[PDB]
Write a protein that binds this ligand. Sequence first.
Ligand SMILES: *[C@@H]1O[C@H](CO)[C@@H](O[C@@H]2O[C@H](CO)[C@@H](O)[C@H](O)[C@H]2NC(C)=O)[C@H](O)[C@H]1NC(C)=O
Ligand SMILES: *[C@@H]1O[C@H](CO)[C@@H](O[C@@H]2O[C@H](CO)[C@@H](O)[C@H](O)[C@H]2NC(C)=O)[C@H](O)[C@H]1NC(C)=O
Ligand SMILES: *[C@@H]1O[C@H](CO)[C@@H](O[C@@H]2O[C@H](CO)[C@@H](O)[C@H](O)[C@H]2NC(C)=O)[C@H](O)[C@H]1NC(C)=O
Ligand SMILES: *[C@@H]1O[C@H](CO)[C@@H](O[C@@H]2O[C@H](CO)[C@@H](O)[C@H](O)[C@H]2NC(C)=O)[C@H](O)[C@H]1NC(C)=O
Ligand SMILES: *[C@@H]1O[C@H](CO)[C@@H](O[C@@H]2O[C@H](CO)[C@@H](O)[C@H](O)[C@H]2NC(C)=O)[C@H](O)[C@H]1NC(C)=O
Ligand SMILES: *[C@@H]1O[C@H](CO)[C@@H](O[C@@H]2O[C@H](CO)[C@@H](O)[C@H](O)[C@H]2NC(C)=O)[C@H](O)[C@H]1NC(C)=O
Ligand SMILES: *[C@@H]1O[C@H](CO)[C@@H](O)[C@H](O)[C@H]1NC(C)=O
Ligand SMILES: *[C@@H]1O[C@H](CO)[C@@H](O)[C@H](O)[C@H]1NC(C)=O
Ligand SMILES: *[C@@H]1O[C@H](CO)[C@@H](O)[C@H](O)[C@H]1NC(C)=O
Ligand SMILES: *[C@@H]1O[C@H](CO)[C@@H](O)[C@H](O)[C@H]1NC(C)=O
Ligand SMILES: *[C@@H]1O[C@H](CO)[C@@H](O)[C@H](O)[C@H]1NC(C)=O
Lengths: 459, 201, 84
Amino acid sequence: SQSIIAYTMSLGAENSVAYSNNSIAIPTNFTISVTTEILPVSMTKTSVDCTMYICGDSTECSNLLLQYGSFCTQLNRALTGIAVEQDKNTQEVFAQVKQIYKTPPIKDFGGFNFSQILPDPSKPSKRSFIEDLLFNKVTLADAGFIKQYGDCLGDIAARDLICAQKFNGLTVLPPLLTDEMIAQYTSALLAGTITSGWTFGAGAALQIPFAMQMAYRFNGIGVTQNVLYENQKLIANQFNSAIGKIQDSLSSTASALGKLQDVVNQNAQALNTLVKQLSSNFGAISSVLNDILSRLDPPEAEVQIDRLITGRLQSLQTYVTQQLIRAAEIRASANLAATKMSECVLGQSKRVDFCGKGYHLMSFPQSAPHGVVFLHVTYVPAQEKNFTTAPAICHDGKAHFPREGVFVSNGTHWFVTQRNFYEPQIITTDNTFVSGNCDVVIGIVNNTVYDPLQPELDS
Amino acid sequence: KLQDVVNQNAQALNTLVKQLSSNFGAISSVLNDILSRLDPPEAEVQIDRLITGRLQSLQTYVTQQLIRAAEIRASANLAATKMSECVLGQSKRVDFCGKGYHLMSFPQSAPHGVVFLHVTYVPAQEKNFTTAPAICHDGKAHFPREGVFVSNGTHWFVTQRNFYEPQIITTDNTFVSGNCDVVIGIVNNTVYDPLQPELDS
Amino acid sequence: NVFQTRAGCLIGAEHVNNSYECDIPIGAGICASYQTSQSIIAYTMSLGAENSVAYSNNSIAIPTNFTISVTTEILPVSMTKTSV
Ligand SMILES: *[C@@H]1O[C@H](CO)[C@@H](O[C@@H]2O[C@H](CO)[C@@H](O)[C@H](O)[C@H]2NC(C)=O)[C@H](O)[C@H]1NC(C)=O
Ligand SMILES: *[C@@H]1O[C@H](CO)[C@@H](O[C@@H]2O[C@H](CO)[C@@H](O)[C@H](O)[C@H]2NC(C)=O)[C@H](O)[C@H]1NC(C)=O
Ligand SMILES: *[C@@H]1O[C@H](CO)[C@@H](O[C@@H]2O[C@H](CO)[C@@H](O)[C@H](O)[C@H]2NC(C)=O)[C@H](O)[C@H]1NC(C)=O
Ligand SMILES: *[C@@H]1O[C@H](CO)[C@@H](O[C@@H]2O[C@H](CO)[C@@H](O)[C@H](O)[C@H]2NC(C)=O)[C@H](O)[C@H]1NC(C)=O
Ligand SMILES: *[C@@H]1O[C@H](CO)[C@@H](O[C@@H]2O[C@H](CO)[C@@H](O)[C@H](O)[C@H]2NC(C)=O)[C@H](O)[C@H]1NC(C)=O
Ligand SMILES: *[C@@H]1O[C@H](CO)[C@@H](O[C@@H]2O[C@H](CO)[C@@H](O)[C@H](O)[C@H]2NC(C)=O)[C@H](O)[C@H]1NC(C)=O
Ligand SMILES: *[C@@H]1O[C@H](CO)[C@@H](O)[C@H](O)[C@H]1NC(C)=O
Ligand SMILES: *[C@@H]1O[C@H](CO)[C@@H](O)[C@H](O)[C@H]1NC(C)=O
Ligand SMILES: *[C@@H]1O[C@H](CO)[C@@H](O)[C@H](O)[C@H]1NC(C)=O
Ligand SMILES: *[C@@H]1O[C@H](CO)[C@@H](O)[C@H](O)[C@H]1NC(C)=O
Ligand SMILES: *[C@@H]1O[C@H](CO)[C@@H](O)[C@H](O)[C@H]1NC(C)=O
């Protein structure tokens, strides 16, 4: 009884924010959420042989293609320009630092578990458990870029894509940086983020306790660092559970990496299509170059072969154009990944939703096939409560404004607390500064401002 | 990087001139050789092969330029962003102006581009310092308003993170939050009170 | 002088254990250079000098001195305007 249904697309659950001049909502509790953002860095490096692709194993045809001249050279000049920048895209993202950092053998992070994001020497290539998942959820070509001629010759796999591309002159150039090395760049960038904080991107790596690192990344998002060490046991548990949810997200759902799988698919589809382009007749009597040479004289073959050359060359010009446009898209995502490597992983991004939803703390790079996966640690307010608020306070007749934080009331007494976490404090002259009077500020209320020096005068 | 902009633009124009020596399947690449030999009926067959190739050559060049212009525009939008956020302002973005904490940037005109001179704050000489998250004076945890807690092996000092300027730990430097039964790694240290000597008078 | 790399069989380059900065990029983590009796050498690309950060709960490194570094970043703005 299942059928196709047609519905108006929902915009999401509608939420009505209750708004009033005297109301504010401050989170009393929060959650540490690790969000997975996945960006393509590099794309498949392809070197096409345009003498081989157009004229297969043919002297008569190749002599005709040489009349076309620079066409074969200018296509490879653009494909090489891609192959160079794809190694440059990977160079700009994964290596921002000259030094390779490693975590010390003794691990005390303050409860934070990083064994999932840290490399595992047990594997043949040193990689994190997540980078092992990232490599297993993206299907690539055969292991290694060396495919023997006898492997294709001795056994012909029925409809084998990679051999057929190579016998047509389509070669996949290996990236300059192996996945084993990329895992060691992400390891160096992660080991510096863990041990040295954000200081390793602006200079020499300066070790700081990861607790103090968390404390000073709360000062960046506007949360007083005292919130950390009170919740440190919880913040480490909320974080370690969030990393544990990255496993269940990657392992169960294999479509999270589809952005990077699309990079492999489009590169394979474009090469596979380029092989299918050879079955087109181009207006010639046959698409086969050997059928024309075995039938028509060179005068009658040149007419037919030049139709094949023009089409097979335009097919390469189409492919190279598809690659240059796609390489500009991958480079834009690589420049974005290189920006999210610097400003997000290496530093702490003040940019809202640049590292994803929530106030960002630090990001963890993870090597993925033809790309990078940033694990973004974000500060998300969890439990909130409405609180009667006021812009200022009238004590002696002078308006008091918070140096940091807001004025809130629980219905009886007015308290001062920071915006992004609820930590009610007695309103004092150290918390609030004196500006102007009470005849101006709109919504101002009357409240006693405690003076820490007042009890000292009682003695 | 800017020489490549001049080279690729010159190479693409120079290649486009070399594109004219291609026969395109026609008997000759020269347009005057065909007109001086074949009748218009036999020339149109040969010339249309040259036109189709020379036009596809321009369509190839224009495509190379549109793709390259989109790359230069992306670098120009990046340069216009580094002109505003870096030169005109002070970039909080890490390694957006280059390595080091950025102060100001100096634009310099270069051929077909711009050269930003980025003034960055780079920590030079560093020293290990025994640190603690908080301090126990009367039994209430003290946290720095700005900076860190450090020790030279005897006395605990408070100083900012990005430069070493040790200061006596005081109630003006540190704020009172919570107690000492929670914070992990907290130590015991006396927090000086600037008001305390005023009560001695 | 025949050597096997991860990118493929490499003939004419000598295998050198010393990992240096990448000079002529090859692929599959291999780079080449022309050095010393001078011949082409084939070496595994070095990732940079390995630095081990000493890390502990009770340790921090604060710079006592600093340097003002002016770095030169060079970006293309405009390209040659061509009217064909
Ligand atoms: C981080 O979490 C992992 C996974 O829970 C911990 O590794 C486990 O260690 C226990 C023994 O303590 C083993 O019984 C499990 O089989 C291990 N699991 C895996 C997948 O390796 C690791 O010890 C934790 N690290 C810290 C510092 O807490
Ligand atoms: C704030 O929320 C966190 C959960 O995000 C609470 O921590 C959980 O508390 C429940 C009930 O005690 C436990 O069963 C969970 O195991 C805790 N999880 C973690 C990560 O520790 C925390 O107690 C809440 N705090 C307040 C003050 O409400
Ligand atoms: C709102 O907060 C104020 C201040 O914490 C509460 O007033 C205090 O109530 C406790 C008893 O629960 C007394 O011991 C304190 O002495 C009171 N304040 C002072 C300064 O003496 C008030 O009860 C709270 N109201 C609500 C509805 O929670
Ligand atoms: C806060 O206190 C001020 C001062 O007592 C209040 O302003 C007075 O309001 C009354 C009654 O209308 C007048 O007779 C006075 O002339 C006002 N005095 C001043 C100094 O302005 C103000 O109304 C109080 N606000 C609240 C919300 O209690
Ligand atoms: C660490 O710093 C403290 C404080 O500066 C040093 O203690 C002082 O030592 C000087 C002599 O060098 C005395 O005149 C001061 O009176 C001491 N402090 C106070 C508050 O009296 C301590 O010697 C330093 N330790 C090291 C190893 O450098
Ligand atoms: C800092 O001072 C506190 C308080 O004197 C110390 O805590 C005491 O530890 C002793 C010895 O085990 C106990 O008998 C007390 O019950 C503790 N008192 C309190 C108030 O907790 C603490 O050990 C000191 N820390 C350091 C590093 O010296
Ligand atoms: C502000 O809030 C008060 C209640 O506290 C309400 O009576 C008033 O209408 C609101 N608007 C103005 C004008 O302040
Ligand atoms: C705050 O007021 C709004 C008014 O709609 C209400 O929905 C909300 O539940 C209140 N606060 C909480 C935390 O319930
Ligand atoms: C700090 O300790 C590390 C431990 O390896 C040491 O290498 C370093 O030299 C020490 N500090 C300085 C400035 O020497
Ligand atoms: C280089 O490494 C190989 C393999 O371990 C070894 O056989 C050779 O002796 C080494 N040469 C040098 C110069 O150490
Ligand atoms: C913290 O540092 C102390 C030395 O100051 C060390 O004994 C302890 O093992 C470290 N780890 C913990 C659990 O604090």
